């Protein structure tokens, strides 16, 4: 394998940053140097395509599938394979919300009960709290396409999502906020995703699909989204061994939810958790090296 270091992008939610460090140490284990960089979560696909960054370890189908597809179409990035995980990223509510709006999880119920989700800032509209803007791109677009009486506010971090959900528990205040599985949160605050329109092939390209035959983004995200691994086209050539390990690398829901939990509940630094997780789970990743 080449002497050039492998460049691993790090973003702004817990499993991704832990997973990234877990994998880095694995690569180092077999003698490949690695370097980390923090990047915007949507823009990283163009960077991988160009080889400014070597790979991406968490290609969520829902949030990043379009940017991935777009890079792939341009050329220069490679679908290395999928983790054995299935993902869902969407508007979500803690279970007590049903008390206020028992038509849920139907998205039409959500909208019917809109005024219940209003905050001082949205006045008469329901408040949806999205995550950082480099995640789900099209909240506002989805609201307009489905013609919902909601307004969208982007949280400044993942932690603000957990703050809001947690802070609504005491008075069982209805809230709807961005969330995903696998992840630690649902285990803390049981709930459900809003059932938006079923994702179908090319709802982010073809208006004729979805409850709005005249515009895009009227679909909810995939209920069984993939979680892919992407690589720069040059990676297999330069680091065949690291690339081969990368094709074998596969984390599951439980492992991912656990990694998230280590930062968000147990309050560990992502790199500390990664080193701990590795040491505690060498039954997991060893065979990826062939041993
Ligand atoms: Ca449509």
Curated annotation (Swiss-Prot):
Q: What is the recorded phenotype of mutating residue 60 to F?
A: Significant decrease in the TMAO-binding affinity
Effect of changing residue 60 to A: reported as: Nearly complete abrogation of the TMAO-binding affinity
Question: Keyword Signal on this protein?
Answer: yes
Q: Which GO terms describe its cellular component?
A: ATP-binding cassette (ABC) transporter complex; periplasmic space
State the Gene Ontology terms under molecular function.
metal ion binding; transmembrane transporter activity
Main location class: periplasm
What does altering residue 135 to A do?
A: Nearly complete abrogation of the TMAO-binding affinity
Which residues does the record give as trimethylamine N-oxide binding sites? 13, 60, 89, 135, 180
Outcome reported for the amino acid change (mutating residue 180 to A) = Significant decrease in the TMAO-binding affinity
Per UniProt, where does Ca(2+) bind?
207, 209, 212, 215, 218
Phenotype of gene-disrupted mutants: Mutant shows significant reduced growth on TMAO as a sole nitrogen source. Growth on trimethylamine (TMA), glycine betaine (GBT), choline and carnitine is unaffected.
Induction description: Expression is induced by TMAO.
Keyword line: Calcium, Metal-binding, Periplasm, Signal, Transport
Supply the CDD domains for this chain. PBP2_BCP_2
Q: What is known of its domains?
A: Can alternate between open and closed states for binding TMAO.
Name recorded for this polypeptide: Trimethylamine N-oxide-binding protein
> What does UniProt list as this organism's lineage?
Bacteria, Pseudomonadati, Pseudomonadota, Alphaproteobacteria, Rhodobacterales
